[PDB]
Write an enzyme that holds these catalytic residues in place. Sequence first.
Site, PDB file in Angstrom:
ATOM      1  N   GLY A   1      -4.047 -11.405   0.568  1.00  0.00           N
ATOM      2  CA  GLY A   1      -4.463 -12.294  -0.496  1.00  0.00           C
ATOM      3  C   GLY A   1      -3.387 -12.488  -1.541  1.00  0.00           C
ATOM      4  O   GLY A   1      -3.292 -13.563  -2.140  1.00  0.00           O
ATOM      5  N   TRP A   2      -2.580 -11.451  -1.793  1.00  0.00           N
ATOM      6  CA  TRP A   2      -1.480 -11.571  -2.740  1.00  0.00           C
ATOM      7  C   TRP A   2      -0.499 -12.654  -2.287  1.00  0.00           C
ATOM      8  O   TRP A   2      -0.031 -13.453  -3.093  1.00  0.00           O
ATOM      9  CB  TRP A   2      -0.762 -10.229  -2.901  1.00  0.00           C
ATOM     10  CG  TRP A   2       0.268 -10.188  -4.042  1.00  0.00           C
ATOM     11  CD1 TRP A   2       0.078  -9.655  -5.277  1.00  0.00           C
ATOM     12  CD2 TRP A   2       1.617 -10.676  -4.019  1.00  0.00           C
ATOM     13  NE1 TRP A   2       1.228  -9.782  -6.033  1.00  0.00           N
ATOM     14  CE2 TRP A   2       2.180 -10.412  -5.285  1.00  0.00           C
ATOM     15  CE3 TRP A   2       2.402 -11.318  -3.055  1.00  0.00           C
ATOM     16  CZ2 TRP A   2       3.482 -10.773  -5.612  1.00  0.00           C
ATOM     17  CZ3 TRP A   2       3.709 -11.680  -3.389  1.00  0.00           C
ATOM     18  CH2 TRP A   2       4.232 -11.399  -4.643  1.00  0.00           C
TER      19      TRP A   2
ATOM     20  N   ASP B   1      -8.112 -10.358   4.101  1.00  0.00           N
ATOM     21  CA  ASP B   1      -8.430 -10.112   2.704  1.00  0.00           C
ATOM     22  C   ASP B   1      -9.208 -11.276   2.117  1.00  0.00           C
ATOM     23  O   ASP B   1      -8.734 -12.410   2.097  1.00  0.00           O
ATOM     24  CB  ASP B   1      -7.092  -9.914   1.974  1.00  0.00           C
ATOM     25  CG  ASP B   1      -7.214  -9.536   0.515  1.00  0.00           C
ATOM     26  OD1 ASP B   1      -8.305  -9.186   0.009  1.00  0.00           O
ATOM     27  OD2 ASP B   1      -6.134  -9.549  -0.136  1.00  0.00           O
TER      28      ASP B   1
ATOM     29  N   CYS C   1      -4.109  -5.912 -18.564  1.00  0.00           N
ATOM     30  CA  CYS C   1      -2.746  -5.456 -18.289  1.00  0.00           C
ATOM     31  C   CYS C   1      -2.228  -4.475 -19.340  1.00  0.00           C
ATOM     32  O   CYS C   1      -1.311  -3.698 -19.044  1.00  0.00           O
ATOM     33  CB  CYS C   1      -1.793  -6.651 -18.190  1.00  0.00           C
ATOM     34  SG  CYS C   1      -2.056  -7.678 -16.717  1.00  0.00           S
TER      35      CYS C   1
ATOM     36  N   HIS D   1      -3.805  -1.907 -20.496  1.00  0.00           N
ATOM     37  CA  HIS D   1      -4.337  -0.577 -20.233  1.00  0.00           C
ATOM     38  C   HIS D   1      -3.741  -0.048 -18.937  1.00  0.00           C
ATOM     39  O   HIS D   1      -3.521  -0.811 -17.992  1.00  0.00           O
ATOM     40  CB  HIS D   1      -5.864  -0.607 -20.141  1.00  0.00           C
ATOM     41  CG  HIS D   1      -6.537  -0.793 -21.462  1.00  0.00           C
ATOM     42  ND1 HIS D   1      -7.400   0.140 -21.994  1.00  0.00           N
ATOM     43  CD2 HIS D   1      -6.451  -1.792 -22.373  1.00  0.00           C
ATOM     44  CE1 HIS D   1      -7.827  -0.281 -23.171  1.00  0.00           C
ATOM     45  NE2 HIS D   1      -7.265  -1.450 -23.425  1.00  0.00           N
TER      46      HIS D   1
ATOM     47  N   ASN E   1       0.401   0.988   2.755  1.00  0.00           N
ATOM     48  CA  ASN E   1       1.714   1.580   2.512  1.00  0.00           C
ATOM     49  C   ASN E   1       2.436   0.638   1.555  1.00  0.00           C
ATOM     50  O   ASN E   1       3.185  -0.260   1.995  1.00  0.00           O
ATOM     51  CB  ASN E   1       2.494   1.719   3.805  1.00  0.00           C
ATOM     52  CG  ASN E   1       1.905   2.732   4.785  1.00  0.00           C
ATOM     53  OD1 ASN E   1       2.590   3.649   5.165  1.00  0.00           O
ATOM     54  ND2 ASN E   1       0.698   2.505   5.254  1.00  0.00           N
TER      55      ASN E   1
ATOM     56  N   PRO F   1       4.311  -1.881  -0.817  1.00  0.00           N
ATOM     57  CA  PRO F   1       5.727  -2.196  -1.001  1.00  0.00           C
ATOM     58  C   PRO F   1       6.169  -2.054  -2.439  1.00  0.00           C
ATOM     59  O   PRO F   1       7.373  -2.107  -2.693  1.00  0.00           O
ATOM     60  CB  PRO F   1       5.842  -3.665  -0.513  1.00  0.00           C
ATOM     61  CG  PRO F   1       4.488  -4.201  -0.592  1.00  0.00           C
ATOM     62  CD  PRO F   1       3.501  -3.079  -0.496  1.00  0.00           C
TER      63      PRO F   1
HETATM   64 CA   LIG Z   1      -6.973  -8.773  -2.244  1.00  0.00          CA
END
Ligand SMILES: [Ca+2]
Lengths: 486, 486, 486, 486
Positions: D102-103, D184, D222, D224, D381, D383
Site C-alpha cells: 500500500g505504501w 495490502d 507525527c 508523538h 523485514n 527497509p
Molecule cells: Ca498498509
Amino acid sequence: MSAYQNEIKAVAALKEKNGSSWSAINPEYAARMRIQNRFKTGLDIAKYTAAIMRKDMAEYDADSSVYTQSLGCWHGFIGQQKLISIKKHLKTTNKRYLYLSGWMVAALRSDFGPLPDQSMHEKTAVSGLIEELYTFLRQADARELDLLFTGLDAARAAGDKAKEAELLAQIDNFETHVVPIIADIDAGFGNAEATYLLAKKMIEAGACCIQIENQVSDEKQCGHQDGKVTVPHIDFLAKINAVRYAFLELGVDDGVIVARTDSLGAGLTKQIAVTNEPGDLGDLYNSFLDCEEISESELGNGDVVIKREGKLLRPKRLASNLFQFRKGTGEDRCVLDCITSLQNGADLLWIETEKPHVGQIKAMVDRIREVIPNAKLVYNNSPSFNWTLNFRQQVFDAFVAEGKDVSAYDRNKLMSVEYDDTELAKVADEKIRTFQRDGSAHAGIFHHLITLPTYHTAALSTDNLAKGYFADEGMLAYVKGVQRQE
Amino acid sequence: MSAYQNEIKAVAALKEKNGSSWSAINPEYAARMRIQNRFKTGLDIAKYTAAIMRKDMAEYDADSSVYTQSLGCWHGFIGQQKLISIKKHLKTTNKRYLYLSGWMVAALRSDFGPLPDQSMHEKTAVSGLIEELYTFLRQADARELDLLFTGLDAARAAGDKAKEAELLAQIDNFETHVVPIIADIDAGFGNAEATYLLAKKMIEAGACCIQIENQVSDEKQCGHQDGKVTVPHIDFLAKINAVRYAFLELGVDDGVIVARTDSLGAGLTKQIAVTNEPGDLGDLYNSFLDCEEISESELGNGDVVIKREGKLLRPKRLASNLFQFRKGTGEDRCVLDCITSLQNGADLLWIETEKPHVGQIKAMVDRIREVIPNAKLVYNNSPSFNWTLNFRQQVFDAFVAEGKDVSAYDRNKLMSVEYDDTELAKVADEKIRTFQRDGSAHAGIFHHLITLPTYHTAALSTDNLAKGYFADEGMLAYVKGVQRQE
Amino acid sequence: MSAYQNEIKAVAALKEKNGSSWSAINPEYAARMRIQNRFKTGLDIAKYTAAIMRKDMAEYDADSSVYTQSLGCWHGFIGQQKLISIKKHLKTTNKRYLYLSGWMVAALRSDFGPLPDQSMHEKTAVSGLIEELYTFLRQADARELDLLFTGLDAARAAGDKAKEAELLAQIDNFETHVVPIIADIDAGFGNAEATYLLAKKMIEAGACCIQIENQVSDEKQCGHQDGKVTVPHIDFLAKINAVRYAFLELGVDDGVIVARTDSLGAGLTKQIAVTNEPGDLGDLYNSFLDCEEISESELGNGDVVIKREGKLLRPKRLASNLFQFRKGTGEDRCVLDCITSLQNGADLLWIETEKPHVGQIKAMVDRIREVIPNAKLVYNNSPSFNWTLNFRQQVFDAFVAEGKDVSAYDRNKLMSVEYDDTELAKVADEKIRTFQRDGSAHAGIFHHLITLPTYHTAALSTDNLAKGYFADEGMLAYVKGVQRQE
Amino acid sequence: MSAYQNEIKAVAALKEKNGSSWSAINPEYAARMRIQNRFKTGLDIAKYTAAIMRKDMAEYDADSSVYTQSLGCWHGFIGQQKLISIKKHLKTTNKRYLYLSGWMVAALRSDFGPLPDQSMHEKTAVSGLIEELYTFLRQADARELDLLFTGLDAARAAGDKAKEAELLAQIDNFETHVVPIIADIDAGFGNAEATYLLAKKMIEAGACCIQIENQVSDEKQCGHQDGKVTVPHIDFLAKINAVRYAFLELGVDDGVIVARTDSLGAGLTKQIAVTNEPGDLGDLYNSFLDCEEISESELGNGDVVIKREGKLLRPKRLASNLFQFRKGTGEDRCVLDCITSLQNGADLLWIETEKPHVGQIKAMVDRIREVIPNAKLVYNNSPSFNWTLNFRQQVFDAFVAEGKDVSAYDRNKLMSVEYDDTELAKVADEKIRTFQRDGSAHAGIFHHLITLPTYHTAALSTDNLAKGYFADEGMLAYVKGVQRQE
Ligand SMILES: [Ca+2]
Ligand SMILES: [Ca+2]
Ligand SMILES: [Ca+2]
Ligand SMILES: [Ca+2]
C-alpha cells in the site's frame, strides 16, 4: 481589432517568421481553431466562472429577484444538452449553472457500479465528471463556431458583404456554453489534507465552487429518524480551510465555498468536542448533548460522563458508540453551524431540509442574518420530496387562517388522483411554480438546484421508449416518441 | 434442492469446517450474496448469452415471426433502465438484447470528448462500456433479489408460510436482467492482430457477439455520394478469423460473428486486390472497378493500369489515391460480400442500407439465400432515416399500382404538417408499426436494432425539462414533467 | 521583490480584502504552496520547455560541442529519479531532456498488458505517461522546496540571519526538475485528423516536442530483411501539418516537430504515389520502385503496371499487396525524406539506422546539408545494437588503413570473453565513450537518446536482488545490494 | 491425454461440427492460444493461489524450515521480472509470493502523483495493480509457451522425434509464473461495507490473501513517538468479517486474511470502546487507557471521564481529541489484538515492529501461542530499519554475556565505515543472512517480505545509469552498466 482578426494576424506573423517551410499552414484556419478553443485549461475555466458567480452574488444582494438556478447532470452529454437547450429557448446562459451531484456520481459513475451515497466510490470519479462536463461544453462551443465559420465562407463565396459582416459579429459576440459549476465534495473523502488534494483536482478540472458538508455519511443510523452524524466545528472548519488553500494555490482567488450543514436531520455525533473555556465552539456543540444525571454509584462500568455546569452527566450513547443530541435542537445547531461557517471562510450556505417550506427556511435565515446580514443560501429543491402532497397540505393550512372551505377538503387524501381543478390544486401548482422566486425573495436563497433530476429524466425517457418499441408499436414508438418531436 | 438452499448448505459446511473462529459468519446471509452475484465474471456472461443467441437463431429459422430486438445504449444506466422497463411491462427478457453502438462510443464515451464515427477514440472505451452495461445489469439483479430476501424475512417474522413459499419460488425462478449484446468493433481498430486483441477484451467483458465491417471509415470521401471505402475480402476475412480465435481462446465456443458490409454505399477502394487465377475473390473484387481503355501513348506518366480480360485498362482514380467502382454495382458487391462472409466463418449478416425498404433488402437476401438458404440479417432501423417521408412515399407508390387516389396526394409534400388523418398517413404509420415484423417475415431479418436511439431520448428529455425549469415554470416543470409521471 | 515575497504580499492583500472570515489563512503558508506549484497546467510546461529546446538548438548551431541528451523513461518515478540524479551529481538540468518511448508504452503501459511496438495499444497511454512524468517532476520540485522552507523556519527559530538569507536565495534561484520531453507519437495512431487529436492531448500534458514517422508499423514483413513499409510523402506531410496545427491551436508557437524516416530499413510500400508532373514528389517516390518490363502478352491477369519514362512496367509485388523498392535505395530515400520534411514544416530529423556508425550517418547528413545547411538530427543510440561488436569491428578496420596489427586479431571473434586489455578493446571502449561527442561534431546530431534503457535497468536490478534474496543470501542480498549503496 | 492434445481434439470437433465455413481455423493453433491462457479470469487465479497458500501454511506447520518469501512490487513489469528471475536461477516458484505494498501504491501509482501512506489515493489503484501484476505474469507464461511451441515446430520440421517428445513434456509440465499475492488493503479505505467492496474488487483481480490493519493512518500524530491511533476490536473485527464475506460471495472458500496490528507503536485511540460487562473486549481495550483521579471539583468544564473499577477517572486526552494509552502497554495490546483476530476469523498475523529482533517477536508469539498454538506470522523485514546498526549492536550485546571482547568495540560507532572484517561484522552479516530462517524457526514466521524494496532498486539503478551517461561516460555508461551484464 476582433479576437478572430487578432489571431489571424498572430498566426500570419509566425508563418512569415518561419518562412516557406510553413507554406502549407493556413493562418485563418489556425485562427479558427484558436477561437474554437477559448478555454485551453480547466484553470482558465475556474477563474472565468468564479468571476461570474461573484458577480451574480453581488447582483442578488442588490435585488432578490435576480437569483440563479441549476440542474444536477450526471454526464457531460447531459450537461451539454442542458446548456444547448438554455441557449436555444432562453437566449442567454446568464443565471444558469451546472450542479455536480455526489449522489449521482455514487449511483452512476463509479468503477464499482451503482453505490449508495456514502463517499465509498473512487474519488477521482468526482473530478473526472467535472472535466467531462467542461469537455462537452467546450466541444459545443467549437461545433457552433465551426458552423458560423462555414456560413462565413459561404457568404464570401456568394459575395454577400452584409451577411459576412453579420456572421463576423456573431463570431465576435459568441456566448460560450461554459458556465459555473457548484461541485459537491461530500465531506472531502478523508481528512483535511485529503480534502485539499481532491479539491485541487476538482478546481484544476474547472470547478470554481466547492460544496462541503459537516456530516459523516458512512455512520448514518438508518434505524433512527434523525440518524445523521455530525462532527465538531473544528473538524469542519479545517476542511473549509483546506478547500481555500486549494483555490489559493491554484490562483483562483475568487473561488467560492458552500458550507452545507446536515444538523437539521442529524441527531448524533461520534465525538465529544474539545473545549478550552465555557461558551467556545466546543462547549456550544457539547451543550446540545442529551445527558442525564446518574449517581456515581448508579453508573455502569465503562460509562462515559461529561462535566457540564459543575456536574457530571451521562450523555445518551448508542451501542454503535454514537452520542445523542437533544430532540428539537436541529434548527439551533443549524443556525450555529451556518453563522460559524460564514465567520470562518465560507461564502455561501446550504441547509439540508426535510421538506420544501419557505417559512421554515426563512425562520432559520432570519436568525442567521441578524448576525450576518447578507448571508446567502444554496437551496436543494429536493427530488425526493413529494411536492404535490407538501404543497396541497401547505395550501390547505393557509386556508385554515380564514379558509372557509377547510371542511370540503379532507387533508389526508389531498394528494389524490382527483382533487385536480379544485382551487387548492391550481393554487398548489401555482405555489410550486413560484416556490423558487418566493424563497429567493423571502429566505435569502441565491441559488436553486435540483440534485438528481437527470437520473429520473434519463430513466423515464428510456422506459417510455422501451415500453412501446419492444411491444406492438415497434419502430412506430421511436418515430412517434422521438423522431416526430425533433 | 434450490440454488439458495444449496448455497446455505455450502457455507454452513465451511463454517463448521473452520470452527468457532467463523462464528460471526451467517451462512444464509453469505448465501444471499452468492445468489445476488450469479455471473461472477464477464466470461460467464459471454457463455450464457452466446447460448441464448444460438437458441434464438434456431427458433427464428423454424418460425420467421420469432425475431429479436435491441436498442443502442450509451451508458450502463441506460441499458439497465431499458431492461428494467422490459421486465416491468413485457414480463420477460426473452428476445430482447443490448446493442453497443460504436457511433455512440465515439460521440459520448471518449476521453477526447465527442468524436466523429471513425474509430479515432481510445479503443478501451468500447470494452469499457460492455463491462459497465453488465455491471449495471448485475446490480439490478442484486437489488431485486435483495428486495425478495427482505420480503422473505418479513414473511418469516409474521409466520406467513404461504408467502414465504411464494417468495422462495420467486427467488428460485428469478429472471436475470443479463441479456446478450451485439457489440460493434467497427473494422477492428487496426490490423487482424489488433482486432483479435480488442475482441478478446470485449468478450472478457461479457460480449457473446461481435459485429465487424469491411469499410475503412477514416478514408470516407464526404464529397462523394457513395464515398465509403472497402477493403478486399482477404483483409476482411482475416479479421473474421481473428475474432473467431478470440472466442475460441476464451472458451466461448458458441460466439457469434456479425459480418457487416458497407458496399451498398461504398464506391471506392484503396487497394487493387491480389488475384492468382481468374474468377477467384481478388479477381471478382477487381472486376467491379471502373476502367477505361487508354492507349499506352495516351497515358500519363505514373498512371496505374491493370490487365483485365487480356487488355491493359486504367481504373478511375481520385487525387486521394482511391480507385472507383462502377456505379450501380453496390448491390452485386453486397451479395458477394455476404455470401463470402457466411462461407468463411461469419454467423450473421448486416447490410448497411440507405433507406428502410423491405423489398430492397428482400431482393438482396433472396440472392444470398439461393446460395446460403438460412442466411440471417441484423438490420439497423436507422435513426437517420426520415421514417415518415420514406413510408408515406412508399405507400403513395403502392397506391399507383391500382391506387386510384394518386392525384389527391402530391408526392413532394407528403411529409407534411398536415397530411395526418389521411388514409396515406394512417397507413404509412401502420407500415412503420409492422416494418420489423414484415422484414423478419420476408427479408430474413433475425434481429432489428436502432443504433443511437438513446442519444436522442437523453437529449430530448433533458431539453424538455430545461426549457421549463429555467423559464417561468420553475419547479413545476420538474413536478409535472418528472415527478407526476413516476 | 522575489517571487516568494510577491506571493506573500498577494495573499496578504486577499486576506485583508476578505476580512476576519479569512483569519485562519496564513499568507506565507499559501505563498509556499504557490511557489511549490510553479507549473499549474501542462500547457504552461509545454511553452516553458519549447523555449528551452529552441535555445538549445540555437546554441548547438553556434557550437557543435553543446549538444543534448536523454534516456527513455517508462514511468513518472523513473523520470523523476533520473532528474534527481542529474541535479545531485551534475549540478544542472541544462542540456538534459526526457524521451517518451513508444516501444516502452506498448511493452509496459497498456491496459492490454505487454504488446509489440505496432501502435495497437490504447493511444491515451501515450499522453497519460507524459502527464505522469510531469506530475512526478512537479512533485520533486514541491518536496525540495518544502525542505528549503523547513530550513528557513529553522534558521528563523535560531535567529540565524545569514542562513535565512542563503535559504531565501536558494528558494529564489531554485532549478526546476521540469525539462523538455521528446514525445514519440509513432505514425499518429490513425489518419491526419487522428494525429492532430492525439498530438493535442500530448501537448496539453506538457509535451513541447513531437516525433512522428513515415512507416506503417502494423504492415512490417518480419520475413524480409528490409521489411518496413513507408507511405508517400503527401501522407506524412499531412501528419506533420496536423501536429503543427495542434501546437498552434494551443498557443505553443515554438513547438518542435521531429520527422523520423524509416526508409533506410524499409524496402516496401503499400501505395503507388499519385503524381501530376514528372519530377514531383510522387514521381520521385515511384522512381525507386523495383520494376520489370513484361510484354502485355506475358502479363498475368490482374497484374498491376505503371508507366515510367514512356513504358509500361510491372513493379515487384508481394502476396501481401505490397510493392518493393530497389535494393540499395534506402539512403537515397532517407535523404529525400529528410530534405522534404525540413522544407515542409519539420524542425528536426531522425534517421533510423541499423548500427551506430558516425561515418554512415555523416554521409547522409552531408547530403542533406548541401540543401539545408543547419539540418539537425535526433539520434537513437539504440539499445538493440551490440555496441562492443560494432565498435571493436569498427576499430579493427580503422587499423587496416595502416593497422599493422590486423593479423593478431581475427575480426570474427573480436567480441569475446577476453580480448579485454588489448589496444583494440581499450580503444573500442574509448570510441564508445566519445561516440556521442563525435557524432555531434561531425554528423549534425543535436540530441542523443537511448529509447528503452530503463526497461533494461529495471529488469536487471530486479533480477539482481531476487537472485540473492530468495536463495541463501536472504535479507543480506537487500542490505548489501540496496541498503549499503544508499 | 495431455492438456494440449485435449484442446486440439476439442477445437477440431468444433471445426467439424461447424463445417467448411471454419476451414481457415487451425485447431492446433487455437489449442496453443488456449494453453497460453490458462487463467482466463482473476477469480481463477484467486482460487488457484489460495490453495497454494493453504498448502504452504500446512507445510510450515509441519516443518518451520519450510517458510515463504516475497518482495513488494510496484508495477506488473517488476513483478514479472522478479518471477522470471526466480524461475531462471532457483528453478521453481514454490515458496515465493508477490506482495502488494500500500505504501508503494500511494507513493507511485496514484492519479494524484506521489502521496504519503494514508489511504488518501483513489482506492482503485490498489485493485488495478493486482490486475496489472497478474496480466504481466500471464503474459510471461504465454511468451515462454509460444517459444516452446516454436521449438516444437522446428523439431517437427527436422523430423527430430526425441526433441519433439521432450518439448511436448516441457509444455505439459510448464510451471506458471502465477503465484499468490499478499494484498495490502490498509484499513479498508472506509467502513466495513466499503472494505467489502474494495476487497471484492481485489479478489476479482486475483488476490487470494488480504492484509488489513487496526490503525487509523490518517490520524497519526507525527509529533508523538508512538503516534499511531488504533480502533476498538469491534470495528476491526467487523472489517475482518467484511473481507470474509467478499471471499465467500466470490467462491474463494480458501481465501486468507492477514490481521495486522499496529498497537506496538500506537499510543492513542480516538474512541473509548463500548463495554457491556467487565472483562469483555471493550473493557479490556479501555483498561489500557492512561487515566488520573481528579476530584469532581478539580475537573475542567467539558472534561470527559470514565468509570473504571468503581471510580470516575479522567483519561489523558490531546487537543486533537485523542486518548492516550499507558506507556509500555504496546506488547500487551498486540498480544490481545492477535489472539482476538485468530479467534474471530483471521488466518495469519502481522505484528508491525520497530526493529528486526527475533527475541522481541518470539516473546510476543510465545504469549500468543499459549492460547493459539499454531499461530503464524507474516513479518515485514522493513527497509526503513538500519539493518547493519541493529545487528552489529545485537551481536555486540550477545558478546557481553561472555563476550570478552566488548572493550575493543565502542557500541556507538559500531556501524561504521570500517569495522568491516572484524568478527562482529562478519558475524553481524551472518546474523542478517540467517535472520529469516531464525525467525521462522523460533518466532512462528510463516512469511517474510520486504514492503518497498523495488522502490529503492528502481531509484538506485536509474541513478547509477544517469550519473555516468549524462557525464563523461556517455554511451559507455550504458554499455558497461547495462549491456555487458545481460
Ligand atoms: Ca498498509
Ligand atoms: Ca454530497
Ligand atoms: Ca461501427
Ligand atoms: Ca515510435
